[PDB]
């Protein structure tokens with residue numbers, strides 16, 4: 001679908017209903033169905049993440065296998081074994097298809113150039129708190145489809161949105 005000379009930029013995240021995506025340096029729920037969904041969308045593509053999101057990756061999947069891991073940092077000496085570190089967004093989006101995988105800061109940074117969002121909404125009532133990382137706000141150019149609610153094996157309810165724009 002994507003012409004190979006172009007640069008499709010997508011954002012992928014899971015959020016509570018409130019928009020909270022991160023808290024205390026972690027994701028404040030566990031949803032294996034969404035872990036699998038995240039792998040399914042991102043596999044075989046370049047993935048771009050902020051340094052704090054790299055830090056938060058489970059050690060057994062750091063770097064995330066099967067994907068070119070790109071970490072944004074202002075720390076020139078940052079050690080990200082098995083990934084590459086860039087100091088600006090410009091050098092991070094040179095691939096034909098790129099998925100931005102977090103966190104709050106880097107979603108906001110990449111949002112102007114994104115034409116796809118894959119959003120998991122978790123039906124968990126976490127009100128916004130000081131310090132939370134938050135999902136980006138999507139303007140009126142976005143459109144998309146809302147999936148049906150499903151229960152995870154644990155009983156946590158979630159649904160998938162697929163957004164796109166020109």
Ligand SMILES: NC(=O)c1ccc[n+]([C@@H]2O[C@H](COP(=O)([O-])OP(=O)(O)OC[C@H]3O[C@@H](n4cnc5c(N)ncnc54)[C@H](OP(=O)(O)O)[C@@H]3O)[C@@H](O)[C@H]2O)c1
Nearest residue numbers: 013014022023025026050051052053074102103104105106
């Ligand atoms: N629910 C989800 O889908 C999801 C996904 C990913 C992450 N998370 C969670 O989100 C939280 C992390 O998000 P966050 O907003 O705090 O941090 P982040 O976006 O993951 O990383 C921020 C770091 O990225 C670097 N950075 C940001 N802008 C930059 C720029 N213009 N140029 C160069 N470097 C830049 C800086 O690294 P340096 O400080 O090293 O300079 C900055 O500290 C965690 O809680 C994580 O668990 C949730």
Ligand SMILES: CCc1nc(N)nc(N)c1OCCCCOc1cccc(CCCC(=O)O)c1
Nearest residue numbers: 012013014034035038039057058061101102120
């Ligand atoms: C899985 C959490 C998550 N979900 C969605 N839909 N989008 C995201 N961007 C996202 O964050 C992923 C990066 C930070 C957390 O990283 C992980 C947390 C738990 C498991 C995994 C491995 C998943 C399987 C794989 O991708 O190989 C990453």
